[PDB]
């Protein structure tokens, strides 16, 4: 059985990788928040505080909190027969807003905007096509296949 640091390491994961070294950007810091955001978790390294244990990068949870430097994310962690919500104390630097949800809503409103426009706003306005289908065809030059060995002396392994 194995050794256990709460920050017990790995091979090639935590290490800060391919030209991706160094501090978080100021863009990172310019960000802005509100709570309830569904944001995803990543690990810089940078400061080895506010830094989750292993579970958590690549997972999406929801923020419940914004503290000075940091934000609270409750995440559902799967134990036995359940997922428990865990509320984790990160400083802001280790988390980011997805698109996961964004689209859904985005579309939903956009669509509504259109659906609404379409009735009950002014205009009227084509989008898409159906799915997939049949068709007339006037092709104009079919081929076939003849494979391997003819002129194999030109090619193949030795």
């Amino acid at each position: 059985v194995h050794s256990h640091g709460y920050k017990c390491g790995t091979r090639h994961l935590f290490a800060k990788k391919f030209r991706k070294h160094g501090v978080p950007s100021v863009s990172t810091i310019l960000t802005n928040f509100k709570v309830g955001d569904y944001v995803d978790v990543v690990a810089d390294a940078a400061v080895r505080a506010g830094m989750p244990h292993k579970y958590y990068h690549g997972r999406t949870g929801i923020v419940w909190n914004v503290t000075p430097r940091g934000v609270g994310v409750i995440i559902n962690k799967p134990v036995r027969n359940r997922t428990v919500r865990k509320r984790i104390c990160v400083r802001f630097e280790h988390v980011r807003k997805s698109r996961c949800q964004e689209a859904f809503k985005q579309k939903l409103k956009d669509l509504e905007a259109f659906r609404a426009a379409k009735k009950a706003g002014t205009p009227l306005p084509p989008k898409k096509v159906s799915t997939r289908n049949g068709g007339f065809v006037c092709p104009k030059k079919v081929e076939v296949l003849a494979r391997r060995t003819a002129d194999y002396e030109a090619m193949i392994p030795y």
């Binding site: 030209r19 070294h21 160094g22 501090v23 100021v26 810091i29 310019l30 960000t31 802005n32 000075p68």
Partner: protein, 298 residues
Amino acid sequence: TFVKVVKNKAYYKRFQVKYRRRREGKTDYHARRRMVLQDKTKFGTPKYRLVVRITNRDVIAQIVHAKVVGDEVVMAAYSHELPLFGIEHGLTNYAAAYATGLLVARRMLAKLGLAEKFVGVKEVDGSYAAVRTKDDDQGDDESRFPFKAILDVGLARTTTGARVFGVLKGAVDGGLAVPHRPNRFPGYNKESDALNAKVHRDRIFGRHVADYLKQVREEASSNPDEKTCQFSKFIAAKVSPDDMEGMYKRAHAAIRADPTKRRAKKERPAEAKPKKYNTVKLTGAEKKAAAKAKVAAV
């Protein structure tokens, strides 16, 4: 210099690159990063960066908000506007750094109207006042963040010569409110902590200059050289060391009294004018033919 390394693709492979103004070596982020950073928690409150700048003997001021996709300059002015306000020779010195701060401060805060909240002394002893909110005697005021902010540097030579100190002082008094630890102004001992505002004021009132514009010439005058070699404009455009305080003093007042911006030639510059001497990226298809014909040749 010296070499035996690959410096090619494996090298490249083995190169990281650092930020643009490190490619440039224009700006060192760490502090900007740290300066810029703002408690989110405390809102999206506007954490303003004051851009603080000197070119090779030239002063530049701006009031900024730091931002993505570029930061944003709300106000700025620099040493050649001081001519509107009559300080025209002077522009490196401690005095001229200062001046610049009072103006911009004022114009910006005139931007939110404030001719007067935060519009300070006119004395310019060269002492200290921090912040806190106080009352309401000044004016031209309103609810949008009361106007304090932070200095953007990139050179910790915070000496008792450093005329960053000057600008600040004007900056602040003319409108700004970044306070500070008053510890290395001109005439200021940290050690056994002492301020001679007076001399700092003297520095703000160029008297070191006055004297150096004394010392340099009329004395040196005995001989033709030294006298023939610096401050040329200054006594070429003839002032006398003494005159000094007035112009500043009144400038200061004029500035503070109204900052309201000077023009420029102003009709549209020329765009074709610069582009007129340029080159742009060559033509490869063609280049291949050009190179190709040559290697074909010799």
